[PDB]
Symmetry: D2
Subunit: 241 residues, 4 copies
Amino acid sequence: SIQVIARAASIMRALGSHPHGLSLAAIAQLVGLPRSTVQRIINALEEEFLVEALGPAGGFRLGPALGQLINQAQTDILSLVKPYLRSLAEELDESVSLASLAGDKIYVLDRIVSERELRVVFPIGINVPAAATAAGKVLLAALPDETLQAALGEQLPVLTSNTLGRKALVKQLSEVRQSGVASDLDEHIDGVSSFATLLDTYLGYYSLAIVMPSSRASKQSDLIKKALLQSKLNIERAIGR
Amino acid sequence: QVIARAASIMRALGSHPHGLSLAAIAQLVGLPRSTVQRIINALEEEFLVEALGPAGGFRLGPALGQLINQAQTDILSLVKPYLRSLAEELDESVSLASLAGDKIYVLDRIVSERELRVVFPIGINVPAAATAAGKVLLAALPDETLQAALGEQLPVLTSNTLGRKALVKQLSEVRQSGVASDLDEHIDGVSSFATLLDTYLGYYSLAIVMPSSRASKQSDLIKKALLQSKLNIERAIGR
Amino acid sequence: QVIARAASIMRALGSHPHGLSLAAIAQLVGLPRSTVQRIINALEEEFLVEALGPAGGFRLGPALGQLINQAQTDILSLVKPYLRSLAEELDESVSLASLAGDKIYVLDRIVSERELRVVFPIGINVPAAATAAGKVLLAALPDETLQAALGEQLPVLTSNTLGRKALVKQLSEVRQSGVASDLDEHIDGVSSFATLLDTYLGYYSLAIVMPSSRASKQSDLIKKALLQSKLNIERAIGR
Amino acid sequence: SIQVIARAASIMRALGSHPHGLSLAAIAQLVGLPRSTVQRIINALEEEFLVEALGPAGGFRLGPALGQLINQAQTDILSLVKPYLRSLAEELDESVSLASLAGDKIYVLDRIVSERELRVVFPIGINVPAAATAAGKVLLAALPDETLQAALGEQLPVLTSNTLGRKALVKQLSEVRQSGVASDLDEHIDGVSSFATLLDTYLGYYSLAIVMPSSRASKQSDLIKKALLQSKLNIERAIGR
């Protein structure tokens, strides 16, 4: 095809994996290219505000233009998904969250809270180790096996007495990776269990999750996972790739 | 330098989330349908773009998400506190938003403890032309692009919602005064005061949303607290 | 007919929750310290009264609760729906309150869905002289008792909070117009419209609490919906 | 002492037990007095608005004056207790409710909801069978054993697969009745457990309860019951009889 656009893209990819910044060196190493031609391409991107330089520190990181490319698109997928959330939420009378992956942590883009007396409540915009959530697992699975080992940077945090370890985690990732859905049982907050499925949108990967008290979970896991799959099918039908 | 052609194309696609015909792309950017086709193909190979079927339409692609996500989820995570702070200094609701065409999008928000309060949900839309936040963002728009959001004739939400004329005129004012406001232009009884955030990742709006009742009195202190917060936030996250 | 003496004593005690000296009780009611002592003793035998130690003070007792509780918890349970209904007809917050001296007490409340909303918690106090609810209740007060709540000189919550004079004058008006209102007399920017509920268990206040912003326009329809609700509720729970 | 005031009082007592109304007959039977002298006393009370007649139906029920006697006092106890609630709530980071008995159902006068993710949420002003709640048990215990058999009108409702039956219920009432506190484990809402203690105020009996997910309850019952007792001691010190 065209090799230089692909070089550029590989560089962007590299920068998006390291939000704090990269040295021209480190960029050059990650991508399979010489510090020189890299410098060239960076410059090209910088001319377009797709990248910025963190001072004479010779560091680089993503730039302004990015926002304006993505914003509308994103604000639309969300706006389109919102209803599909409420629906699900009211079919199951359980809280549901829509999240995206940001390295080792997922990020909650949206959420509907259950009316129930025994309820699970969290705020939009919250972080939480991907390794401990159903959503996090569902996203981690879809990760290219090369990239995966980035999020699984050596050893995992442990949030409860059930939080998986790298081994059982990967092993299970293999399972979700073709079973379609994932779950967590008191692996994040003791007494809470979640059930998530992947959303493959044209804009990237999202996680659709049900978050509920384990108390009530043990009984209806069956119906939960199903409603999730139905919602995945719908949503993707309307917004997939 | 073909990189710049590509970039111009991406820019074009981000302005039209529903999709563009190879033709329309070719026209918007100053390039021939052919070389454009070429570049599209190049991007498509990278999932930076997708084709809406034999419809010959194109729109943004998967890779995008994975580029932006972390960065974004960080700016937000970093700004969140700066919101609470402001919120508690003024005891008024505050929202952080971004522009999506003619509508702003609320990324985050803190609601006032107060008895007479203004309450809205995260993830809400609202015509940019009617909000302080929307004005602050619209101002920063390149004057070429501006006329996109200001497509033809504005909606009118109240008996005060500005019209294209007074709107642009005022945009010129905010565009160097630094901040913007709206007085019962969105919801009657509500007034807002916003300022621009120029982050390395793009433009955001930091806004105070409050009952006009309480606004008429303290506009002065509001605008100031906003500017102080802009200075802080940008000091820590600017470009 | 000694039953009436007793009752007068209870009445006296309910007006002074902190307690009364046998003396003060004797003076308030038109009876001699002696026969009063007698009756107190009789009531005390029934736990309708208690003695605040050798301090010779007296105040209400345990049995009271068990007499009232069920009845009360029923009126409330019966009124709750009538609240929601009203709330959704007007899309404005509504409160059900009772009088406790100079302050009203919010027994229940439904909060408006709206963006510009008024929010308060159940169980809150607020000077009766400043609320529509408070006025509606104060009106129904026997003119003798009234001068108890209107002890000397009123608090002033805003730059509109009435003064004893205009207050009484207006009480005369509500006292046969049926309903009362307050315009930024409690919290600036908030206005309320209340009506009396004459239940078999006592007097309640049914009120709409809303932003003045939105009030100036629809006072008319508010007062009407209130009256309709009063008529219904009383039809089902009046005396 | 004085016998007629006591006759009257007995009548009031009778009426407060039957909020819907009593026939002069039924009143006469409940209290140990003749239909005649009862009629007399009723009349005396009616002159004072302590009672009303439900029409020629010859029925009677409580009256207006009542409210004005109790209101202030009540609105004060509540106002005084409110803080003691928040305090407790924040010491345990669990929801707490203040309730009173209304026959077979308790009535929630006030409540503070936990900040927590797995939380229990209910509205003020709610009813719920006393036989199924810790609060309800605590109040039922304090009931005179004669009166008790009113609330325990034959057979109980059953809210869960754990809701006690009249037998185990009474048996347990004997226990709380000198242990001081009561509890319910998934007897009201499956997954929810509560721990309550009695408040003996000068104005009557109240229930102070902690309501939490059983999940989190099994672990800290111990500390809960203690904080409850401490709060009872405080509150009563300030508002007891």
